């Protein structure tokens, strides 16, 4: 259902969370097209312990991978 980043539950804006067995991705429902999980394609809401089905996983932050000027 969602990805648990550091204490916060991340749901997908559009698409579903899927995994190849090792890594987790966001993909549109009607066509398999993996995307790295980011704060752009997933919206945070609630807490990590309110929804059943949580899977702990990192959520990439595209705002400052390299932009740490």
């Amino acid at each position: 259902p969602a990805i648990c980043h550091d204490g916060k539950a991340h749901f997908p804006r559009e698409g579903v969370f899927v995994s190849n067995g090792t890594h987790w991705f966001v993909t549109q429902r009607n066509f398999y097209e993996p995307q790295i999980i980011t704060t752009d394609n997933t919206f945070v809401s609630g807490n990590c312990d309110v929804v059943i089905g949580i899977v702990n996983n990192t959520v990439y932050d595209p705002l400052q991978p390299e932009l740490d000027s």
Partner: protein, 49 residues
């Protein structure tokens, strides 16, 4: 077991919690509205039946 994917093509399985989450997303309420209170929704559906 598959929502409406079986009406378009081959039946594609999906957890029923996620199916109802998308069906909530189809009426204008975000997915988390169901997940944060999934038990309440399930109890309401069972009581209605």
């Amino acid at each position: 077991t598959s929502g409406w994917t079986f009406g378009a093509g081959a039946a594609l399985q999906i957890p029923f919690a996620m199916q109802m989450a998308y069906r909530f997303n189809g009426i204008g309420v975000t997915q988390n509205v169901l997940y944060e209170n999934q038990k309440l929704i399930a109890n309401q559906f069972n009581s209605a039946i």
